[PDB]
């Protein structure tokens, strides 16, 4: 299956209170492997998966160097954006950046991407071709003309194809027993009387990885898109994910309803019905 | 509102002394990287500074240290100077958009055994052969700068008060007067070549100028020969009709 | 030893294409640059390459091959102004320093239209008692060897562009403080072009 490596960064100003709060996390697929927090003791990039602990001091030095540089670029970006939008020194604002790599089954490059937001709204992103930027407003156009002049996209493309992918390949080998494992969902179904005439049927997927899943209900084969309560897919806390889908149904008409479970780790899609 | 700046331009020091080198980055630039370039070798990375702290450091010993100030300028200090620290110290500035590094003019440091070893150039112009004019309709002047140490000089030719480039060739590297000796003095040659009609105008005036980088007025000096201060030394000639 | 260049000198005939190669070992090498350094001066950025492939800019072409781990600079239509040391620099993904090669020296050897080798004697402007030998107008093929006698000094050959007259010329200089020293026998360690002109 495909794999991704993705870095997420958040910087939040706090006039009066010091340097902005800066938080960085790295992921391979749905698994966190690295962390940096600007208010923590160490002032280092820190390990968050067993398989990254194997890297030596030359790696943590490099990753600490660069993560610090990202935090310093956000510090400036906050100031610059404050100026372009004419906002006051006292208010508190946020930048967010996410970039990374995808690869296919073959582990060859598939797509790369880099997105950026100020106060939760898109500011600028790199297009699919990794050669040009899409720009939110007149402030983003300014930044795009500047980055064109400075060959920024070209530098980032080199990384996105190339370096990013090579590290993703290495993390996937070193961490083979957790990253290349696919846990299929353990399923079950539940039934609650709502007073007279109606019952809830709730369909569960627990203990699965990766987080991608589709859970649907059908009555007599026909999809219940409108009627079904879904919950956002959610972390269990142990590397694995949980999800459920509920539907309300008329009493004694529950055999008509069937729950459909799709996941990478299932050979074929699962079908379940109420078995009292 | 302009390019990368470094001072001093040239320094002469003895073993065991300390030096401070200054660098200011180019106007849009906020990061400064120091490099050491030994004669005939490539620049070797010492440090890079950003937002007043040491972002990255090279492989150099504790003797080398540095700093960056709020205006983004920077200092390299090196202590307990060895002869082997003789080099071109290059400062390079970059921004945080493109990250390309653009080098400054460099401080040339020479660490010598004793300040007594330094001597300015002696300079002389030699006038064209009447043979060359005859055979060729052209006339070569030769400048010769002799007996100088250390080996940084800048040789230029001037005609009627204006500095010239067309028609010049100066040796790319100066020659050791005594190859055996480690503190040998140096020599350097240059040619200016003009038409015979140009050289034959006795109104035309030719001057060979050698800028020598030497001792500063911080340097003690007790010898009898004149203090080998940084100075310019020249020789000249006038054209000759027939 | 991380970035490798040959020192040279490398020679390229004037007008011809000059080729410089550079080799590197670190697989994380991401960004590559070529610097030019004239004698007595600091290095000057002339090209960056961030992508595998060829990159053309004026007379310069850079070629990067990251699988074979080399990088090249080609200079079309070589000029005398192009004689300088060319340094190759590389930046890895782990940081912000440049690792440099030692520098390849390029000498663009000029085409001498009508050579007329000769050795002339030049008298000092100040005083007749001191003198100098100029070997000039020899063909670029001629190398000039240093004298094996100490106390007689010989410079290397140097090329001078008299631009107004579209004319180029080689020259070297020889001098000594010995009374038994003649221009006639000054360049005797050097391979004499046949009937170089010796006046007196």
């Amino acid at each position: 299956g495909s794999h991704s490596m993705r870095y997420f960064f958040t910087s939040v100003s706090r006039p009066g209170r010091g340097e902005p709060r800066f938080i960085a996390v790295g992921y391979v697929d749905d698994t966190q492997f690295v962390r940096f927090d600007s208010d923590a003791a160490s002032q280092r990039m820190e390990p968050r998966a067993p398989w990254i602990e194997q890297e030596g001091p030359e790696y943590w030095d490099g990753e600490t160097r660069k993560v610090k540089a990202h935090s310093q670029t956000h510090r400036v970006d906050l100031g610059t954006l404050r100026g372009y939008y004419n906002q006051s020194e006292a208010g508190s604002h946020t930048v967010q950046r996410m970039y990374g790599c995808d690869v296919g089954s073959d582990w060859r490059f598939l797509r790369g991407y880099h997105q950026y937001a100020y106060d939760g709204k898109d500011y600028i992103a790199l297009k699919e071709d990794l050669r040009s930027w899409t720009a939110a407003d007149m402030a983003a156009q300014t930044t795009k003309h500047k980055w064109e002049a400075a060959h920024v996209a070209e530098q980032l493309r080199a990384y996105l194809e190339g370096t990013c992918v090579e590290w993703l390949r290495r993390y996937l080998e070193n961490g083979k027993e957790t990253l290349q494992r696919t846990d299929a969902p353990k399923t079950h179904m539940t039934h609650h009387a709502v007073s007279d005439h109606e019952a809830t049927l709730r369909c569960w997927a627990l203990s699965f990885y990766p987080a991608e899943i589709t859970l649907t209900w059908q009555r007599d084969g026909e999809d219940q898109t409108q009627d079904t309560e879904l919950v956002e897919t959610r972390p269990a806390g142990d590397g694995t994910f949980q999800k459920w889908a509920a539907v309300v149904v008329p009493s004694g008409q529950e055999q008509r309803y069937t729950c459909h479970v799709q996941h990478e780790g299932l050979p074929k899609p699962l079908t379940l019905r109420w078995e009292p | 509102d302009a390019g990368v700046t470094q001072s001093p331009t040239h320094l002469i020091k003895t073993r065991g002394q300390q030096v401070t080198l200054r660098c200011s980055p180019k106007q849009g630039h906020d990061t400064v990287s120091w490099y050491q370039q030994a004669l005939g070798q490539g620049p070797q990375f010492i440090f890079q500074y950003y937002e007043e702290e040491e972002r990255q450091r090279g492989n150099f010993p504790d003797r080398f240290s540095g700093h960056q100030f709020p205006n983004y300028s920077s200092e390299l200090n090196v202590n307990a100077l060895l002869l082997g620290d003789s080099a071109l110290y290059l400062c390079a500035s970059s921004d945080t958009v493109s990250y390309e590094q653009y080098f400054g003019p460099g401080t040339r440091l020479t660490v010598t055994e004793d300040l007594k070893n330094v001597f300015p150039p002696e300079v002389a112009v030699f006038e064209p052969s009447e043979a060359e004019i005859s055979h060729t309709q052209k006339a070569t002047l030769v400048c010769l700068a002799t007996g100088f140490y250390p080996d940084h000089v800048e040789l230029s030719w001037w005609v009627n008060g204006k500095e010239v480039h067309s028609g010049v060739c100066t040796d790319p590297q100066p020659l050791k007067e005594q190859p055996a000796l480690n503190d040998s003095r140096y020599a350097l040659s240059s040619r200016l070549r003009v038409s015979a009609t140009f050289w034959q105008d006795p109104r035309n005036h030719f001057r060979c100028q050698v800028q020598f980088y030497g001792l500063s007025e911080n340097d003690e000096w007790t010898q009898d020969r004149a203090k080998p201060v940084t100075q310019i030394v020249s020789a000249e000639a006038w054209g000759r009709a027939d | 030893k991380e970035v490798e260049q040959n020192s040279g000198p490398l020679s390229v005939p004037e007008g011809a294409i000059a080729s410089l190669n550079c080799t590197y070992s670190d697989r994380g090498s991401q960004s590559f640059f070529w610097y030019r350094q004239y004698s007595g001066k600091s290095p000057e950025l002339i090209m960056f390459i961030y992508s595998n492939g060829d990159k053309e800019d004026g007379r310069f072409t850079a070629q990067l091959n990251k699988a074979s781990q080399y990088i090249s600079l080609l200079i079309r239509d070589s000029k005398l102004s192009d004689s300088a040391t060319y340094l190759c620099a590389v930046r890895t993904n782990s940081g912000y320093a440049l690792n440099f090669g030692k520098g390849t020296s390029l000498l663009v050897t000029p085409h001498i239209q009508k050579p007329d080798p000769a050795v002339y004697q030049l008298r000092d402007s100040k005083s007749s008692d001191k003198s100098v030998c100029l070997f000039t107008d020899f063909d670029s093929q001629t190398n000039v060897s240093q004298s094996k006698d100490s106390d007689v000094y010989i410079t290397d050959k140097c090329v001078l562009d008299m631009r107004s007259m579209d004319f180029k010329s080689n020259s070297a200089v020889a001098w000594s403080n010995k009374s038994d020293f003649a221009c006639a026998n000054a360049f005797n360690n050097s391979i004499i072009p046949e009937d170089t002109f010796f006046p007196s």
Binding site: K66, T73, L156 | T96 | -
Partner: peptide, 9 residues
């Protein structure tokens, strides 16, 4: 690993 030459706005 992280990208090195991250650019400012």
């Amino acid at each position: 690993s992280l990208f090195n030459t991250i650019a400012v706005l």
